[PDB]
Amino acid sequence: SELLVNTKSGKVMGTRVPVLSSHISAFLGIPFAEPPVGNMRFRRPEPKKPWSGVWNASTYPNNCQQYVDEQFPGFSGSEMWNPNREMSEDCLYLNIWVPSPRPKSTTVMVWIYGGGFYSGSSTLDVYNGKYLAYTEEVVLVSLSYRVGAFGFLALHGSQEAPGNVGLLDQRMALQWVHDNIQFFGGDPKTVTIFGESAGGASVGMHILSPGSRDLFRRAILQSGSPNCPWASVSVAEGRRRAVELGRNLNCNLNSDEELIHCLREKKPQELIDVEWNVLPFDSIFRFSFVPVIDGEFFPTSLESMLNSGNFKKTQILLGVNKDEGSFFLLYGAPGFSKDSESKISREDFMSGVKLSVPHANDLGLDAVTLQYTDWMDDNNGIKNRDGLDDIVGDHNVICPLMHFVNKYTKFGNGTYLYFFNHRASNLVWPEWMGVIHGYEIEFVFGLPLVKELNYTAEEEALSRRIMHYWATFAKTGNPNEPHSQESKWPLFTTKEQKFIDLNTEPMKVHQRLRVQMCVFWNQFLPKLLNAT
Amino acid sequence: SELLVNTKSGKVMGTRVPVLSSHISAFLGIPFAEPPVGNMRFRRPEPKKPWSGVWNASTYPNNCQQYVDEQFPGFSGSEMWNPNREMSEDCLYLNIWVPSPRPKSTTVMVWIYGGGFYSGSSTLDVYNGKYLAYTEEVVLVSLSYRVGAFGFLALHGSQEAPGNVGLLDQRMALQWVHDNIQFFGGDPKTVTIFGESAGGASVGMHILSPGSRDLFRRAILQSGSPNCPWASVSVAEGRRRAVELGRNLNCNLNSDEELIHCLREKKPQELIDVEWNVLPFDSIFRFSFVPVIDGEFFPTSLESMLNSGNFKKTQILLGVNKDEGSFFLLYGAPGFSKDSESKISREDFMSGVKLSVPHANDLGLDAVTLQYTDWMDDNNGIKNRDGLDDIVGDHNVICPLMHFVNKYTKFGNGTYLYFFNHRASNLVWPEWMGVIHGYEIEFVFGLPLVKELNYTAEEEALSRRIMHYWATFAKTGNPNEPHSQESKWPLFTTKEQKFIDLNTEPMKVHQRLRVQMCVFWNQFLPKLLNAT
Ligand SMILES: COc1cc(CNC(=O)Cc2cn(CCCC[C@H]3C[C@@H]4Cc5nc6cc(Cl)ccc6c(N)c5[C@H](C3)C4)nn2)ccc1O
Ligand SMILES: COc1cc(CNC(=O)Cc2cn(CCCC[C@H]3C[C@@H]4Cc5nc6cc(Cl)ccc6c(N)c5[C@H](C3)C4)nn2)ccc1O
Ligand SMILES: [Cl-]
Ligand SMILES: [Cl-]
């Protein structure tokens, strides 16, 4: 009864799940779109046709077709991110965790997974919404969206493969939440979207996109922003990559209709097998099929929208991790290894810089090298390693986010900024990688509250603080509880630019997050590359 | 008798001068060239014709015609550098201080004054060679040379104003020392030339010039090097400035012969009155008439000579002061004043950068600004002031000297490098100016040994250490006395790049003097400006 919900598309039957020492309801694998299969591959999603009978929402759905990381087989640190369900193009489902007893009209949070727009699953253990829904009394939704070529192959001008359809998948799930979350006890006028990495970029893209803005109230962006250099391409570059994808699969390339028809006859794994072959440069932190600046989802360039205030004005909470670059260097840069401290030679440093800034000319590469090299101590393998780590994280995550924060705050209604720099005590990744891209998520989703997962008591307390910040922000637009005597997370303002550290020690307020390096990345290096 | 010396140009009669609690002999105002007056203005010097009778060498000679600093009338800090004798184009004389009793064959040191190639006198109180000659038992020579347009007006191709004649003045004095210092008790095979600022650049130019190299044994360069950006111009730029000088004086400009003839009829002060009007840029630390890269005194570019080892291979001792830039900012940059702490606004900082790097385009100016700005604290007037101080000293003195040191040491026979960072207790200049350009000279010449000058006992001890370093280097090629248990000043080597601080505390050895900034000035910024 508590597990049966009538929605506008039909009835759904959930399941009662244990969480800590209580229970909540879960509605898993609810369809929000028609299966984008067959001649619907690459096309914009269509709403799910209403169904007769009762939809069995007791088990997780399929994951979308995607590249699977096999670099460390059996290693939990990498396999925890891989699809844990069967992959299928039939994958547009969402999941809902609902407090028990069912609320009347409570705050909703919608999670958008990341994964470079080429990977991601709503069903990962680390995305289990039951601890957040139970602890903070929110309705927690996780959506899914097509990734890779399936979600982002872009042949602008065509209506069969227009690009951005993964983002339209996200939007269709938000539309379904807007239309139906009331029946689960959610308040559709108090929806917060939040996401990490490409999901953080996606959140920012719905803030910008006129077609998405009305479908949520406020937003949280973790380690990703819409202006990140990896997060979008021009329509010309998307077309070049789509044509190169067909060339890899022996397709007729004489027209969009012939190319799209050829690509639609291929099995999913044949696209995945060649997807990485279309990148224009030898690079790390660059992905083949990503959002395209198309003039429809995004009416103009991202920079001109941010400059003019052409975006949703609301409250945002966002931040970054200390060592965003380390994951990408481990997988893609010579000299880095999982089982060594990865001290980097001068030659491997120069190779890494070239991989990390693929669009740079030799003068640009010299500028990056000078900015990040201690010339009193240039053969220090630890400083070279940490310098490359900083280059990758500053260029790809931190400095684009700081540019976004400063543009947004001029027109927005409240900005809260964090710097997550706690390394978990039970981390299976080597110590040189520090505070890794993606490893704040387990604190946001409350995994340290689970005794068997071997976190410390301080880490459980940190997780509870973070979950309460997130859910209080979602509820009110302010992560701070009023009338409480805890230290206050201050607003980020244009003038004072305050942020907080997120770790196990007492809260410290700082100003101008990595301002020196972000002047280099956001102002000087673009000017240098444009003049040369 | 001890005061009478027969030389190859004739007899000279010196004077007995008191020094501390003893006496030495002084031979002041000995002519080494014919007076470069009349139709000899701008021409290469001619040897002084031998004279009958006894030359009265008991009084200082005239100083060369030059610009006189009147920015702080009556202020000893600036007036101590001005001519202290009557100015005259009849000014090619040298001075000799000789220990008593007259030595047989002792080390000779020849001082070359600086002053931006536009000023300087051999007769300044701070250049009095009697303390060094007495204390260290050397024969101390100070020469003179034409400065300004008189010494450096350059119309390449003409034999009436070929350029570089001030450097040929220096060379003619060195030739006279080579030919005659034996009669004063000097060893002509153990001559060290030393000089500060433009005199340091000049010393380096005689190391490079094939026509000068045979006239001395080893060399000391203080706060100046031949490759400094202010120390030379091309023949085209020298010609442009000579023509502009004539335009300022209503000269016929249709041929070299007409221009030179017009310039030779002008009184000296009319040239001096307009000399600063010919500079191509709004600048500081740039001078109108300087050595020209002519293909004769310098056979090729300074850089190609340093790269190929086309220079005298010997021992060198050289170094810089901590705050070389402060003097130039005080006189030439907005926001700096003698009687205030000169806290610099953001706007005056940007004006100062533009003055300090006049050849830079806007991208180059942004690169300099980023390198020297703390963007966590960019409105700190003390940091802006000290940042400009560092820009001026790094660009104009320290980084060119470090480029010279590293090129020279590849082929040379021994390099000793110092960093003078002691601020004298009795300095009359404000504290913001720090360790000023030129203020190591009083320690080299032993002024702290004079009780009435109000130095401390530690500063007398520092002066004695420096004088002993200099004279022991002059004597042996090594500033360290063998068999002594004092801490050793190590050789500067290509690999370890060691240097010492010179101050009142116990000697400390460091490595890679200002290497971070000099990579910027010597490698990155030239590459940036060449590509743009
Ligand atoms: C793998 O083999 C090669 C790899 C390369 C180098 N490849 C690349 O540079 C392509 C690339 C791939 N990526 C990864 C994008 C990030 C996707 C995810 C983001 C989210 C957080 C996260 N963090 C992880 C951290 C570690 Cl240590 C390990 C796995 C992580 C992970 N899967 C995720 C997911 C995916 C969610 N960046 N660049 C070259 C040649 C190769 O043969
Ligand atoms: C003075 O009026 C103006 C001045 C300017 C600015 N002028 C300039 O930038 C031209 C310039 C002149 N200079 C000086 C070159 C250095 C020459 C001397 C070097 C040696 C060491 C020395 N140090 C001194 C330190 C102080 Cl604090 C004061 C005087 C010093 C001094 N005369 C010397 C001499 C000269 C020997 N650099 N740039 C613009 C407009 C003006 O009306
Ligand atoms: Cl680390
Ligand atoms: Cl200072």
What DSSP assignment string belongs to A384-406? HHHHHHHHHHIIIIIHHHHHHHH
Nearest to B195 by CA among B319, B77, B107, B87: B319
- Closest Cα to atom 22 of ligand 2: B438
CA-CA distances (angstroms) from residue B512 to B19, B29, B262, B368, B405? 40, 42, 51, 21, 11
| Phi, psi at A127, each rounded to 5° | -100, 10
Classify residue A456 as left (phi > 0), alpha (psi -120 to 50) or beta: beta
- At a CB cut-off of 8 Å and minimum separation 6, what does B74 contact? none
- Identify whether the C-beta of residue B403 lies closer than 8 Å to the C-beta of residue B519: no
Nearest to B88 by CA among B142, B46, B31, B47: B31
Q: DSSP assignment, residue B481?
A: P
A322 Cβ below 6 A of ligand 1:
no
**In the numeric block, which tokens belong to residue B465?**
């250490």
* B375–A512 C-beta distance less than 8 A: yes
Rounded to 5°, the CA angle A69-A70-A76 comes to 85
CA–CA separation, A148 vs A244, rounded Å? 14
The minimum-distance atom of ligand 2 relative to the CA of B82 is: 32
- Identify whether the C-beta of residue B95 lies closer than 8 Å to the C-beta of residue B60: yes
CA–CA separation, B517 vs B391, rounded Å? 9
Number of C-beta neighbours around residue A497 at 10 A: 18
CA–CA separation, A380 vs A374, rounded Å? 9
CA–CA separation, A12 vs A31, rounded Å? 10
- Identify whether the C-beta of residue B10 lies closer than 8 Å to the C-beta of residue B94: no
Nearest to A269 by CA among A83, A33, A99, A432: A83
CA–CA separation, B176 vs B174, rounded Å? 5
CA-CA distances (angstroms) from residue B347 to A442, B90, B249, B335, B354? 48, 46, 36, 10, 11
Query: How distant is the alpha carbon of residue A62 from its chain centre?
Result: 20
Cβ-Cβ contacts under 8 Å between A and B: the total is 45
Question: Three-state SS for A245?
Answer: helix
Query: How distant is the alpha carbon of residue A376 from its chain centre?
Result: 38
Block residue for tokens 């009538």 = A6
Nearest to B518 by CA among B417, B395, B436: B395
Instruction: Name the β-bridge partners of A317.
Output: A220, A416
- At a CB cut-off of 8 Å and minimum separation 6, what does B122 contact? B60, B61, B63, B93, B94, B95, B111, B113, B142, B143, B144
Which residue of chain B is at minimal alpha-carbon distance from A496? B376
CA–CA separation, A21 vs A402, rounded Å? 41
Q: How was this structure determined?
A: X-ray
- Closest Cα to atom 41 of ligand 1: A332
Rounded to 5°, the CA angle A421-A423-A425 comes to 150
Q: DSSP assignment, residue A493?
A: -
Block residue for tokens 């399936």 = A150
Nearest to A444 by CA among A105, A133, A29, A60: A133
Q: Say how many Å lie between the first and final Cα of chain A, rounded.
A: 67
Q: Does residue B265 carry a catalytic annotation? A: no
CA–CA separation, A180 vs A492, rounded Å? 34
CA–CA separation, B489 vs B509, rounded Å? 8
Burial of B193 (0-12, 13-18, 19+ CB in 10 A): buried
Mutate which of A222, A279, A437 for ligand 1? The one with the most ligand atoms within 8 Å of its CB, which is A437
Q: Give, to the nearest 10 degrees, the angle between helix B198-208 and helix B165-180.
A: 70
Q: Tell me the CA–centroid distance for residue A327 and ligand 3, in Å.
A: 12
Q: Residue A525 belongs to what H/E stretch?
A: helix A525-531
Q: What is the dihedral angle through the alpha carbons of A430, A431, A436, A439, rounded to the nearest 10 degrees?
A: 80
CA–CA separation, B525 vs B530, rounded Å? 9
- Identify whether the C-beta of residue B500 lies closer than 8 Å to the C-beta of residue B486: no
- At a CB cut-off of 8 Å and minimum separation 6, what does B418 contact? B317, B318, B319, B320, B489, B499, B500, B501, B502
Which residue of chain A is at minimal alpha-carbon distance from B528? A363
**In the numeric block, which tokens belong to residue B147?**
């400065």
Mutate which of A331, A354, A357, A435 for ligand 1? The one with the most ligand atoms within 8 Å of its CB, which is A331
Going B472 to B477 to B482 to B488, the CA torsion angle's sign is: positive
Nearest to A110 by CA among A130, A100, A126, A95: A95
Nearest to B168 by CA among B101, B233, B215: B215
CA–CA separation, A323 vs A423, rounded Å? 10
CA–CA separation, A362 vs B136, rounded Å? 54
Nearest to B12 by CA among B100, B132, B87, B96: B96
Nearest to B29 by CA among B51, B66, B55: B55
Which residue of chain A is at minimal alpha-carbon distance from B512? A376
- At a CB cut-off of 8 Å and minimum separation 6, what does A250 contact? none
CA–CA separation, B429 vs B71, rounded Å? 13
Question: Three-state SS for B288?
Answer: coil
CA–CA separation, B177 vs B183, rounded Å? 10
**Residue numbers of the domain that contains A159:** 1-532
**Counts for chain A of helices (H) and strands (E), in that order:** 18, 16
| DSSP code string of B321-381 | ETBTTHHHHHHHSTT--TTS-----HHHHHHHHHHHSTT--HHHHHHHHHHH--TTSTT-H
Rounded to 5°, the CA angle A13-A19-A24 comes to 30
Among B365, B374, B376, the strongest candidate for a mutation testing the A interface, having the largest count of A CBs within 10 A, is B376
CA–CA separation, A165 vs A260, rounded Å? 15
Residues of B in contact with A375 (CB under 8 A): 512, 515-516, 519
Q: Tell me the CA–centroid distance for residue B230 and ligand 2, in Å.
A: 13
Sheet bearing A4-7, strands edge to edge = A4-7, A10-13, A54-56
| Pairing of β B93-98 and β A106-112 | unpaired
| Phi, psi at B190, each rounded to 5° | -135, 55
Going A119 to A122 to A126 to A127, the CA torsion angle's sign is: positive
CA–CA separation, B386 vs B195, rounded Å? 27
Out of B370, B516, B527, name the one closest to residue A363 (CB). Answer: B527
Resolution, rounded to a tenth of an Å?
1.9
Q: Tell me the CA–centroid distance for residue A435 and ligand 3, in Å.
A: 8
* Number of domains making up chain A: 1
- Identify whether the C-beta of residue B212 lies closer than 8 Å to the C-beta of residue B242: no
CA–CA separation, B98 vs B50, rounded Å? 22
- Identify whether the C-beta of residue A20 lies closer than 8 Å to the C-beta of residue A134: yes
**In the numeric block, which tokens belong to residue A377?**
């101590």
Block residue for tokens 């800034």 = A357
B204 Cβ below 6 A of ligand 2:
no
Question: Three-state SS for B498?
Answer: strand
- Identify whether the C-beta of residue B160 lies closer than 8 Å to the C-beta of residue B257: yes
CA–CA separation, B209 vs B194, rounded Å? 16
| Phi, psi at A515, each rounded to 5° | -65, -40
Among B519, B520, B522, the strongest candidate for a mutation testing the A interface, having the largest count of A CBs within 10 A, is B519
Question: Three-state SS for A488?
Answer: coil
CA–CA separation, A200 vs A112, rounded Å? 8
Number of C-beta neighbours around residue B382 at 10 A: 13
B285 Cβ below 6 A of ligand 2:
yes
CA–CA separation, B259 vs B239, rounded Å? 11
CA–CA separation, A159 vs A155, rounded Å? 8
CA–CA separation, B282 vs B358, rounded Å? 7
| DSSP code string of B331-347 | HHSTT--TTS-----HH
Which residue of chain B is at minimal alpha-carbon distance from A520? B370
Residues found in chain B:
532
- Identify whether the C-beta of residue B54 lies closer than 8 Å to the C-beta of residue B13: yes
Residues found in chain A:
532
| DSSP code string of B157-186 | T-SSSBS-HHHHHHHHHHHHHHHHGGGGTE
Q: Tell me the CA–centroid distance for residue B431 and ligand 4, in Å.
A: 6
CA–CA separation, A511 vs A491, rounded Å? 11
CA-CA distances (angstroms) from residue B391 to B2, B185, B298, B402? 51, 45, 29, 15
CA–CA separation, B154 vs B291, rounded Å? 8
3-state SS of A33-101?
A: ECCCCHHHCCCCCCECCCCCCEEECCCCCCECCCCCCCCCCCCHHHHCCCCCCCECCCCCEEEEEECCC
Query: How far does B378 lie from chain A, in Å, by closest CA?
Result: 11
- Identify whether the C-beta of residue B243 lies closer than 8 Å to the C-beta of residue B278: no
CA-CA distances (angstroms) from residue B123 to B19, B95, B445? 16, 8, 13
- Identify whether the C-beta of residue B358 lies closer than 8 Å to the C-beta of residue B287: no
Nearest to A323 by CA among A389, A373, A388: A389
- Spell out the alpha helix ranges (H) of B55-115: 76-79
Number of C-beta neighbours around residue A159 at 10 A: 9
CA-CA distances (angstroms) from residue A192 to A107, A140, A464, A518, B527? 8, 10, 19, 28, 49
CA–CA separation, A406 vs A316, rounded Å? 12
CA-CA distances (angstroms) from residue A485 to A417, A465, A481, A489, B225? 20, 14, 9, 12, 64
